[PDB]
Write an enzyme that holds these catalytic residues in place. Structure first.
Site, PDB file in Angstrom:
ATOM      1  N   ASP A 158      -7.696   4.353   4.392  1.00 43.67           N
ATOM      2  CA  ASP A 158      -7.763   4.267   2.937  1.00 43.67           C
ATOM      3  C   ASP A 158      -7.917   2.816   2.483  1.00 43.67           C
ATOM      4  O   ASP A 158      -8.655   2.527   1.539  1.00 43.67           O
ATOM      5  CB  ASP A 158      -6.521   4.913   2.306  1.00 43.67           C
ATOM      6  CG  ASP A 158      -6.589   6.449   2.312  1.00 43.67           C
ATOM      7  OD1 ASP A 158      -7.598   7.007   2.811  1.00 43.67           O
ATOM      8  OD2 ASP A 158      -5.640   7.102   1.815  1.00 43.67           O
ATOM      9  N   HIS A 202       0.857  -1.185   0.000  1.00 44.73           N
ATOM     10  CA  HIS A 202       0.000   0.000   0.000  1.00 44.73           C
ATOM     11  C   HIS A 202       0.893   1.235   0.000  1.00 44.73           C
ATOM     12  O   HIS A 202       1.769   1.378   0.860  1.00 44.73           O
ATOM     13  CB  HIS A 202      -0.931   0.036   1.208  1.00 44.73           C
ATOM     14  CG  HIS A 202      -1.960   1.116   1.118  1.00 44.73           C
ATOM     15  ND1 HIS A 202      -1.739   2.395   1.581  1.00 44.73           N
ATOM     16  CD2 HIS A 202      -3.172   1.139   0.513  1.00 44.73           C
ATOM     17  CE1 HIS A 202      -2.767   3.161   1.263  1.00 44.73           C
ATOM     18  NE2 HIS A 202      -3.650   2.422   0.612  1.00 44.73           N
TER      19      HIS A 202
END
Ligand SMILES: C[C@H](CCC(=O)O)[C@H]1CC[C@H]2[C@@H]3[C@H](O)C[C@@H]4C[C@H](O)CC[C@]4(C)[C@H]3C[C@H](O)[C@]12C
Ligand SMILES: C[C@H](CCC(=O)O)[C@H]1CC[C@H]2[C@@H]3[C@H](O)C[C@@H]4C[C@H](O)CC[C@]4(C)[C@H]3C[C@H](O)[C@]12C
Ligand SMILES: C[C@H](CCC(=O)O)[C@H]1CC[C@H]2[C@@H]3[C@H](O)C[C@@H]4C[C@H](O)CC[C@]4(C)[C@H]3C[C@H](O)[C@]12C
Ligand SMILES: C[C@H](CCC(=O)O)[C@H]1CC[C@H]2[C@@H]3[C@H](O)C[C@@H]4C[C@H](O)CC[C@]4(C)[C@H]3C[C@H](O)[C@]12C
Ligand SMILES: C[C@H](CCC(=O)O)[C@H]1CC[C@H]2[C@@H]3[C@H](O)C[C@@H]4C[C@H](O)CC[C@]4(C)[C@H]3C[C@H](O)[C@]12C
Ligand SMILES: C[C@H](CCC(=O)O)[C@H]1CC[C@H]2[C@@H]3[C@H](O)C[C@@H]4C[C@H](O)CC[C@]4(C)[C@H]3C[C@H](O)[C@]12C
Ligand code: FES
Ligand code: FES
Lengths: 359, 359
Positions: B319, B166
């Site tokens: 997120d 990520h």
């Protein structure tokens, strides 16, 4: 007209004909950077003689010899054509093939580069991911060549010692994977499991700090991200030989394991090679895909085409060389760090050879 | 006001006080997903009793307990605060801590989530790189909970089973590495070698197909790319225990090897953790940085700060959860493929539990 910039393409090489097998093996068992053996100079020729028949047989099974030189030549020629247009300032460019264990040997290539009176010499490994046993050995050969010939180089040297994630390399792999997936029956496309297969290493080597595993893993992650994780995958290792422990899981055991667990649609991907060789044409295509696969009851097993003559790959090679020239890089930052447990004194000398180059 | 979406943060957990050490070890040796043992139910308590004193002593050396719950709590709270604004459609959000071996146990958390009558339940592993021994074991506990309670779940489940690359996780590591490099004497900054240290795995686990090594490797590559390869590095493994073969090179031997080879400026990076625990506060900071380092004559050895309370990390968590909810993902594609040599029957059942989820 006379060549200005030479690009020495480094690769292990492979026997062109069954007759070349014996010397291939001999040079291989004589390499200290690869293995140390008692009375090596006496054993090596012996071990080569006894393995020769078995290895010649493997090459006979794929057509009578390795295509490495043919593919390397075509990639090199394509690379040069592009470089002449990409970097006029360093043209004309000329590629040289420096195989570690078969002709043209690394030493012969260097001898030829010096005779051509080049200004620039770039040691361009054809192994995207660095291993002290592959790229490292080829780099050591260059250092040893000058050290043995007793005289400094007449050309400014530098190296492209690794390139595991070059965006065009990744695109070539992704493209080949996608076109191969299109070859599976439509009904099975989504069920296919991708086995990225790279050459394994003895754990003794992995444990000394070899960069290889981590870099191969990097390439796999990059390829899968470009494929948007369309299929599940696993990175497995092939070519283990002997009784000692090697890095696994093994590719053959994984294929067998997958079948017994209901995953009978497999796509093998030679992630650490840029062209075909005995490992792909024989081990993966025949040993695993024909024999093992049959004994296991696989439904569909295919292998992504090796990069070989893909025009995009030659472009990748040219871009790497071009970027290397424009950056004035002598080598990667990674080459300045030897394995934490390296016991080969030549490694530090080889590193210095490239980091100390003039200009 | 009533919680709508629950986020179960999964982690091994750690004893909060020295008194919690015994049950911690006990639950850990009782986990079949982690290790099979003869008459396990009988040996487990015994093994826990003999290891307790030594483990308590380790925790005493770092302050008397693990900070994992404190850091997990702050990250979860930060995450929730962001999600309530990022995803109004699934608010209010509530985080639950599900430690595998200490209170609050995964089971207690699930029991609490059901009592809260949530509509959505997300199994959010706090291990960015998937291992059947870490994330796998935690997911198996969720499946086993419902199967043992003899009741179907009342909330729609799904999982974020991995997130090795990520972009915000990578930025956090890069940021902490850079600020730690700033702490080295200016004259040695460029000489610093970065040792990415991740928890090792026994080769028997690596060889069955565990995806962990390849994913950790991916994280290392992304971090290094963001740092533009400013310094040379190597990925090493720590925490090996016992006489059996584990994946190397080992972090302690690498530190010693580097010093013996003149590389005495080292930066350690706990690349597989999101917060501090015994592995970083004791093993890396005391065992390796204070003791081992002194005996080896290191000039400078520092360790990048753990992500802990970095607000960017909570943003990363929110997120990830947000994208997961937007995509209707039930799990990663990777979870749909079990290890080629998996011998644990619950793995397939656990996989099916998530892939078969309604809605
Ligand atoms: C002992 C040594 C390996 C040492 C090491 O652990 O690194 C191994 C490497 C290759 C081996 C040799 C090769 O396998 C070829 C021969 C095989 C025969 O079965 C024994 C003799 C034989 C000549 C082997 C002797 C010995 O076991 C060797 C020389
Ligand atoms: C084990 C070693 C790599 C060691 C390392 O990680 O440094 C590799 C490099 C080249 C390999 C050899 C070459 O591929 C040539 C032969 C190929 C055959 O399939 C096995 C024997 C064979 C002789 C190989 C033995 C072994 O796997 C070698 C010697
Ligand atoms: C398999 C082959 C012998 C074949 C034969 O005699 O039939 C032997 C000869 C020398 C061996 C190698 C050498 O002993 C050097 C390495 C020793 C490590 O323990 C394994 C890898 C390692 C690279 C060995 C691989 C393999 O077992 C080799 C290549
Ligand atoms: C035999 C089994 C491993 C089986 C396998 O992995 O195939 C191992 C795993 C842990 C071992 C046990 C643990 O090491 C704890 C004890 C250690 C003592 O030295 C022997 C008894 C002792 C109780 C061991 C018995 C046996 O060797 C065990 C149970
Ligand atoms: C080996 C095993 C992971 C196996 C796997 O990957 O399948 C790991 C998981 C948790 C580990 C244990 C936990 O970290 C708790 C203890 C930590 C100590 O530093 C060593 C003993 C200790 C008891 C560890 C032994 C071993 O390394 C364990 C049991
Ligand atoms: C070191 C510890 C025993 C400590 C003691 O009794 O003093 C033993 C107990 C059970 C062992 C584990 C179990 O045997 C299960 C695994 C067996 C593998 O061969 C090594 C990893 C493995 C995960 C072992 C790691 C380690 O050796 C453990 C954790
Ligand atoms: S063996 Fe890797 S640098 Fe020497
Ligand atoms: S041990 Fe990896 S899926 Fe079962």
């Amino acid at each position: 007209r006379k060549p200005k910039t030479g690009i020495l393409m480094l690769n292990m090489g492979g026997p062109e004909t069954l007759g070349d097998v014996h010397d291939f093996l001999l040079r291989l068992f004589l390499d200290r950077d690869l293995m140390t053996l008692p009375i090596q100079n006496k054993l090596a020729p012996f071990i080569a003689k006894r393995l020769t028949p078995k290895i010649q047989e493997q090459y006979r099974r794929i057509g009578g010899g390795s295509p490495i030189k043919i593919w390397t030549s075509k990639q090199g020629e394509g690379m040069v054509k592009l470089l002449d247009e990409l970097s006029p300032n360093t043209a004309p460019h000329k590629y040289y093939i420096g195989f570690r264990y078969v002709h043209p040997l690394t030493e012969e290539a260097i001898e030829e580069m010096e005779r051509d009176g080049l200004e620039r010499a770039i040691a361009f490994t054809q192994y995207p991911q660095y291993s002290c046993s592959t790229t490292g050995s080829s780099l050591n050969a260059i250092y040893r060549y000058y050290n043995q010939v007793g005289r400094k180089p007449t050309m400014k040297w530098s190296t492209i010692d690794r390139w595991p994630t070059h965006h065009l390399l990744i695109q070539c792999f992704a493209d080949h994977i996608l076109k191969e997936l299109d070859h599976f029956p439509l009904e099975k496309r989504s069920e296919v499991v991708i086995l990225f297969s790279a050459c394994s290493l003895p754990m003794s080597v992995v444990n000394r700090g070899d960069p290889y595993p981590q870099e191969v893993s990097a390439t796999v992650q990059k390829v899968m991200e470009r494929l948007e994780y369309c299929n599940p995958y696993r990175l497995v290792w092939q070519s283990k030989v002997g009784p000692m422990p090697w890095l696994g899981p093994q590719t053959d055991e994984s294929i067998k394991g997958l079948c017994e667990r209901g995953r009978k649609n497999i796509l093998l991907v030679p992630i650490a090679f840029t062209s075909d060789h005995i490992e792909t044409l024989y081990e993966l295509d025949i040993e695993y895909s024909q024999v093992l696969a049959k004994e296991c009851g696989v439904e569909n097993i295919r292998r992504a085409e090796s990069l070989n003559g893909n025009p995009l790959f030659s472009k990748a090679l040219a871009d790497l060389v071009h970027s290397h020239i424009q950056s004035n890089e002598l080598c990667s930052k990674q080459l300045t760090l030897s394995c934490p447990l390296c016991v080969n004194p030549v490694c530090r000398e080889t590193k210095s050879f490239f980091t100390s180059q003039q200009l």
